[PDB]
Amino acid sequence: LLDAKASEHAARMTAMKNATDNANELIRTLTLSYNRARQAAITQEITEIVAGANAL
Amino acid sequence: KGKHVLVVYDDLSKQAAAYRELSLLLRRPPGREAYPGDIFYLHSRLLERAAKLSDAKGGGSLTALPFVETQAGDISAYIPTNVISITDGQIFLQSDLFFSGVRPAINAGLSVSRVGGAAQIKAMKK
Amino acid sequence: KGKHVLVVYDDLSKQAAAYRELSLLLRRPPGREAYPGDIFYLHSRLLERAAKLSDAKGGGSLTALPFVETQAGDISAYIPTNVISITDGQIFLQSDLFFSGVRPAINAGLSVSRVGGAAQIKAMKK
Amino acid sequence: TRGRVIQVMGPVVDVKFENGHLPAIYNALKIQHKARNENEVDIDLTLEVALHLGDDTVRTIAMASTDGLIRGMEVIDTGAPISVPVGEVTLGRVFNVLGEPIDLEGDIPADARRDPIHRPAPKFEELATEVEILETGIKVVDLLAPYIKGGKIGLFGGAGVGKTVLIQELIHNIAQEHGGISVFAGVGERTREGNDLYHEMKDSGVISKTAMVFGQMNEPPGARMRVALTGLTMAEYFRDEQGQDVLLFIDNIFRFTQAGSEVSALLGRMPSAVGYQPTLATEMGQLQERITSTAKGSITSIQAIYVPADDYTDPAPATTFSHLDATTNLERKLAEMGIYPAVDPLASTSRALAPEIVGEEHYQVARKVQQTLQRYKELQDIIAILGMDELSDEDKLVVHRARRIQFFLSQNFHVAEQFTGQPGSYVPVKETVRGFKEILEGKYDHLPEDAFRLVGRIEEVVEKAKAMGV
């Protein structure tokens, strides 16, 4: 019984570490698309403003 | 004349696009997304004609059910935001609920009726 | 004349907006966020007049504490970036900490002072 | 000295006058015509001057529909801006943008005095030198979000929460206690809602102390622009002459800027960052700066704000938020639970909640109430999932007292008497502070939970409990 308890604790610790690693992996893949959308918004808005100004 | 009328509009986004095309062809300065500045006025003029008359006017009534189509479920777009702030409520349909066997896929959590309660019989209210 | 002066500016974003309004009314070509092409020059010309004179000039000094107000806590906007690229540091105030009840709600994780360390007494430094 | 019509481009009309007789800016013009034959339509319009062009040309903004206009028509100059009647006659009446009565009770005699719409702001010397607190008689407002005399209050909330009831009870309490006058102005809102509010006021009888101005969504932007200024110039008379305290209600300030943004496109101005007008800040300031408290009287305003798509970085909300002093939030969850007026105790904040203004005891009581409510809020999921058991002896007492506090936060109103038979009450700040202090101390831990519902003063809880048989 004591051996089983020790093995259970070790397994839980390993699983938690793996979950943390997976989340840290996903973060940067999110940030890349974040940056792309950030550039796209500005490149749309500046063109819209210039086109509106050129009408007069 | 004292009758009751029901009016259904199939699409307002197409009408807005046609108005934008006409304004651009008439050489008027564009706004955001090339739309003209008076699209809100254009929609409000149409949507303000539905009402219920008083007893002195005969007691007639008229109701409208406009339709709006969204792209990829984006509810924060310019035309949907303009239309939402005019009507008395919204009904939402979701493909996620549609594919899960729930049809009609009416989202009861987001649907809002700002006149409800007074438009139901006592049996249903109870 | 050899004295020490302290100057505090309440807001620079409002001044920038007023300058943008004047330039737009005068029909000058616009840039990013409809701002003119010399807003950075306008800010730097004002902010570059504070200095510590030498012994030959008289030994006078002048210091400034400009303020900038942000919307929803972002610091990526054009005017905040321009001001940060000029100043020697910044002090952050946390809306959540202020809501909690801490006065002042200074965030020490983002504040920095490039001149710091050489402007303290020995006791405080130790 | 009469003009001609040259260009019609929708809501914008251009007029040419004789040399040396150009009208001033903001002056009003009239167009009256009768059909000469079967191919014409009668026209009645009002115009105001906006810009001065080069060759004796003036560009104006229409106050109504421009259909049927013909190039070459005649224009009459009035020589003065829009004038609106003021005085005790306007009490209990409904007016349009131009000041003409809408209801069927008759017309106002032409000999009554009138005042111009536009007016400069008060000077620096005429303002007060200290901050004062306006007492309303509502426990939640007086305890968690005090109102200052002369500030601006922002209100957030949807339909079916009791906004009309709250407005009615505020007007009733102010008129009863301070002898003030309330003015309501609706800008770009629903006609059905306006009619419902008018009928509710008629039923409640509060209409005898209020004057109403209606410019709604179906009106053109030119008409929608001037409603707020008309309401303000109606309200200013009582402060300037009688030296009273006046309430001003604005239905929606977002439409005020939206109409200007719509109008500015046709005048030939360059667009702004998000397509707005370049003069948004000046236009907002010239209107907001006229609501101040002087040595003779005071004016305070409650404004409802709508945020499109819940985006707080939009320029119009960003500019409007810079003038507010306090906010009140209404909660549908609190409304469903049966608690009125269902004001959120945690979302609402005020600038005047400082120990230098309200007092150390008030500050400590408010801070303790906020702390215990915030602590109670965090246990919702744990309680709902795992039940009330497995909780420590401290959290159980916390949730024991939180229910009492939350139920005591409610109140009964005067205007609700017609449906329940309960007269209502007016609770002073000292009384509510003492009651909350006693509750926090815990002198009433043995009383039933339902005894704290819709009582008013603290001493009525004991009587209600005794009536319940405790």
Add this chain to the structure above:
Amino acid sequence: GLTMAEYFRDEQGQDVLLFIDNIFRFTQAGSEVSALLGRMPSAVGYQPTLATEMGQLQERITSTAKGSITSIQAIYVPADDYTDPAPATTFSHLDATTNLERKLAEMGIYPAVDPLASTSRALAPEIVGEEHYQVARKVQQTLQRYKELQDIIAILGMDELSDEDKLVVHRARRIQFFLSQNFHVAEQFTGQPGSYVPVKETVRGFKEILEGKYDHLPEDAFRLVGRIEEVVEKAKAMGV
């Protein structure tokens, strides 16, 4: 091409079948030309008259009482953006649509048709059949439910799922792999002859798969197999 095609069904009443290689290049050329004519740009630089120009051409291809015309068209999606105005404005003219996904293509599934995005007007109980309708609805429901668990699966793994979710994933993987097929054209690059599958055969195979009859076979045996019977022989050749 359209004025060549119309004559047959207008003067002889014969059935005509039509192909269009890529309809997006028409609107692209129109946008390229409209710039020099003096018109103001649209939202994304297109011509202001994008809708009416496409509508005039699309409304001309219809079936009348004299004859019928069937057409198959290919549409290009620029930069893999389905919200672009040109792809977005052509959805209202079609009856049945099929969508291809790069994510499905990269996994080795061909022809990589999205099973949830594709729709058709003929999918009705009174047109196809009750059994076919039920099988299609069940397959779509299982695919959607499998899709809903990706966020949990990617982080916490398959251990935390219940008994039902494990079976749902087990059958969804088999269905997704079985949806693939091998074509006759690809024989010159792989040497596999290809297959032709009838509607009754594929319906029966999908019903048998949904019934749980083949839960003991490896998932790799369902790739490019054609009929259901070949799955068993592929598995026994593999060694199961």
